[PDB]
Amino acid sequence: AQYEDGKQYTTLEKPVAGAPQVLEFFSFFCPHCYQFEEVLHISDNVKKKLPEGVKMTKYHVNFMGGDLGKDLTQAWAVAMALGVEDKVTVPLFEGVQKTQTIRSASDIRDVFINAGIKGEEYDAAWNSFVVKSLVAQQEKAAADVQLRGVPAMFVNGKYQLNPQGMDTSNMDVFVQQYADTVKYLSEK
């Protein structure tokens, strides 16, 4: 066929019921994730090709960057709760990988302050049980698919994107192939 299991995607031996339709995992410590966000805009191009009605979910993971990795999963929970993902994603990536000015929870917090979230609102979110359960959800979703690598994308809890099997000579062609594959899997 044109799309083949084990080629542009793999199938989960252990499908995950009730999973989000399009589920993306990343880490701010993850170098391909930085590319995916800032150079390729994967999430965005996937959304542009997804059917009407399908919702898109993105979670941070703990298994990179030790203690700071967990702070970043909690900070991402804060971003989701406040709905400020689109204002902190770039400075978090650049703070961790480019300028390396993020070294502590307080540095993560500075990024939110600079993006205009108020201190009191940030600290209130950070400490909230709603954020605690949002962290729980991020962990559980990754646990459900026994996740050991990022970036990763899963469609309907049964298919996992496999970018290793796509031409990388052209970055645009790569992105469209990726997005088209998500759409195909979505319609499966």
Coordinates of C-alpha atoms in Angstrom, one line a residue:
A1 CA 0.0 0.0 0.0
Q2 CA 1.0 3.6 0.2
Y3 CA 0.7 3.9 3.9
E4 CA 2.2 0.8 5.6
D5 CA 2.2 -0.2 9.2
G6 CA 5.8 -0.2 10.3
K7 CA 6.6 2.5 7.7
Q8 CA 5.0 5.9 8.3
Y9 CA 3.5 4.7 11.5
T10 CA 3.5 1.7 13.8
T11 CA 0.5 0.1 15.5
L12 CA 0.2 -0.3 19.3
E13 CA 0.2 -3.9 20.4
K14 CA -1.8 -2.7 23.3
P15 CA -4.3 -0.1 22.1
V16 CA -5.4 2.6 24.6
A17 CA -9.1 3.0 25.1
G18 CA -10.7 6.5 25.6
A19 CA -7.5 8.2 24.5
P20 CA -7.4 11.7 23.0
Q21 CA -7.9 11.6 19.2
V22 CA -4.5 13.3 18.4
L23 CA -2.0 13.1 21.3
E24 CA 1.4 14.6 21.1
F25 CA 4.2 14.2 23.6
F26 CA 7.2 16.5 24.0
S27 CA 9.9 17.8 26.4
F28 CA 11.5 21.3 26.5
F29 CA 14.8 19.4 26.8
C30 CA 14.2 17.5 23.6
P31 CA 16.2 18.7 20.6
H32 CA 13.9 17.3 17.9
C33 CA 10.9 18.8 19.8
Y34 CA 12.5 22.2 19.5
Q35 CA 12.7 21.7 15.7
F36 CA 9.1 20.4 15.6
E37 CA 7.9 23.5 17.3
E38 CA 10.0 26.3 16.0
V39 CA 11.2 25.2 12.5
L40 CA 8.6 22.7 11.3
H41 CA 5.5 23.8 13.2
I42 CA 4.2 20.2 13.2
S43 CA 1.3 20.7 15.6
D44 CA 0.1 23.6 13.6
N45 CA 0.3 21.9 10.2
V46 CA -1.4 18.8 11.5
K47 CA -4.3 20.9 12.8
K48 CA -4.7 22.6 9.4
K49 CA -5.3 19.2 7.8
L50 CA -7.3 17.6 10.5
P51 CA -11.1 17.1 9.8
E52 CA -13.7 19.1 11.6
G53 CA -14.5 18.0 15.2
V54 CA -11.1 16.4 16.1
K55 CA -9.4 17.8 19.1
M56 CA -5.7 18.1 19.6
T57 CA -3.8 17.3 22.8
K58 CA -0.2 18.1 23.8
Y59 CA 1.6 16.9 26.9
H60 CA 5.0 17.4 28.5
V61 CA 7.0 14.4 29.9
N62 CA 9.2 13.8 32.9
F63 CA 11.9 11.5 31.7
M64 CA 14.3 14.2 30.4
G65 CA 16.1 16.8 32.5
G66 CA 15.6 15.2 35.9
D67 CA 14.2 17.6 38.5
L68 CA 13.8 20.4 36.0
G69 CA 12.0 18.0 33.7
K70 CA 9.3 17.6 36.4
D71 CA 9.0 21.3 37.1
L72 CA 8.5 21.8 33.4
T73 CA 5.7 19.2 33.3
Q74 CA 4.0 21.1 36.2
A75 CA 4.6 24.4 34.4
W76 CA 3.1 23.0 31.2
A77 CA 0.1 22.0 33.4
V78 CA -0.1 25.7 34.5
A79 CA 0.1 26.8 30.9
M80 CA -2.8 24.5 29.9
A81 CA -4.9 25.5 32.9
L82 CA -4.4 29.3 32.1
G83 CA -4.6 28.7 28.4
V84 CA -1.3 30.5 27.7
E85 CA 0.5 27.7 25.8
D86 CA 0.9 29.9 22.8
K87 CA 2.7 32.5 24.8
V88 CA 5.2 30.5 26.8
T89 CA 6.1 27.6 24.4
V90 CA 8.8 29.5 22.4
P91 CA 10.5 31.2 25.4
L92 CA 10.6 28.0 27.4
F93 CA 12.2 26.1 24.5
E94 CA 14.7 28.9 23.9
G95 CA 15.3 29.3 27.7
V96 CA 16.2 25.6 28.0
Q97 CA 18.0 24.9 24.7
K98 CA 19.2 28.2 23.2
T99 CA 20.1 30.7 25.9
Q100 CA 20.2 28.2 28.7
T101 CA 18.8 30.7 31.1
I102 CA 16.3 28.2 32.6
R103 CA 18.0 26.4 35.5
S104 CA 15.4 26.5 38.3
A105 CA 11.6 26.6 38.9
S106 CA 12.1 30.3 39.5
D107 CA 13.5 30.7 36.0
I108 CA 10.6 28.9 34.5
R109 CA 8.3 31.3 36.4
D110 CA 10.2 34.3 35.0
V111 CA 9.2 33.2 31.5
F112 CA 5.5 33.3 32.4
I113 CA 5.9 36.7 34.2
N114 CA 7.6 38.1 31.1
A115 CA 4.9 36.8 28.9
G116 CA 2.5 38.8 31.0
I117 CA 0.9 36.2 33.4
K118 CA 0.7 37.8 36.8
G119 CA 2.8 36.4 39.7
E120 CA -0.1 35.8 42.0
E121 CA -2.0 34.0 39.2
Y122 CA 0.9 31.9 38.3
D123 CA 1.7 30.9 41.9
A124 CA -1.9 30.2 42.6
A125 CA -2.1 27.9 39.5
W126 CA 1.2 26.3 40.3
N127 CA -0.1 25.2 43.7
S128 CA -3.6 24.3 42.7
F129 CA -5.1 20.8 42.8
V130 CA -6.5 21.5 39.3
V131 CA -2.8 21.7 38.2
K132 CA -2.0 18.6 40.2
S133 CA -4.6 16.6 38.3
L134 CA -3.4 18.1 35.0
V135 CA 0.1 16.8 35.9
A136 CA -1.5 13.4 36.7
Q137 CA -3.2 13.3 33.3
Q138 CA 0.1 14.0 31.5
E139 CA 1.8 11.2 33.4
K140 CA -1.0 8.7 32.9
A141 CA -1.3 9.4 29.1
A142 CA 2.5 8.7 28.7
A143 CA 2.3 5.7 31.0
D144 CA -0.5 4.2 29.0
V145 CA 1.7 4.0 25.9
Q146 CA 4.9 3.1 27.9
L147 CA 6.6 6.2 26.4
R148 CA 10.4 6.3 26.3
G149 CA 10.9 8.8 23.5
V150 CA 9.8 12.2 22.3
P151 CA 8.6 13.8 20.1
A152 CA 5.8 11.3 19.8
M153 CA 2.3 11.4 18.3
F154 CA -0.4 8.9 18.8
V155 CA -3.7 8.8 16.8
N156 CA -6.9 7.5 18.6
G157 CA -4.8 5.6 21.1
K158 CA -3.8 3.0 18.5
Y159 CA -1.3 4.4 15.9
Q160 CA 2.0 6.0 16.6
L161 CA 3.7 8.3 14.0
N162 CA 7.0 7.1 12.7
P163 CA 9.0 10.1 11.3
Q164 CA 12.2 8.0 10.8
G165 CA 10.4 6.7 7.7
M166 CA 9.9 10.0 5.9
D167 CA 12.2 11.9 3.5
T168 CA 14.1 14.7 5.4
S169 CA 15.8 16.3 2.4
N170 CA 13.1 18.9 2.3
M171 CA 11.6 20.2 5.6
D172 CA 8.3 21.3 4.0
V173 CA 7.8 17.9 2.3
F174 CA 8.5 16.2 5.6
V175 CA 5.9 18.2 7.4
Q176 CA 3.2 17.6 4.8
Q177 CA 4.0 13.9 4.8
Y178 CA 3.7 13.9 8.5
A179 CA 0.4 15.8 8.6
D180 CA -1.1 13.8 5.7
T181 CA -0.2 10.7 7.6
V182 CA -2.0 11.9 10.7
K183 CA -5.1 12.7 8.6
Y184 CA -5.0 9.2 7.0
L185 CA -4.7 7.6 10.4
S186 CA -7.5 9.8 11.7
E187 CA -9.8 8.6 8.9
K188 CA -8.8 5.0 9.4

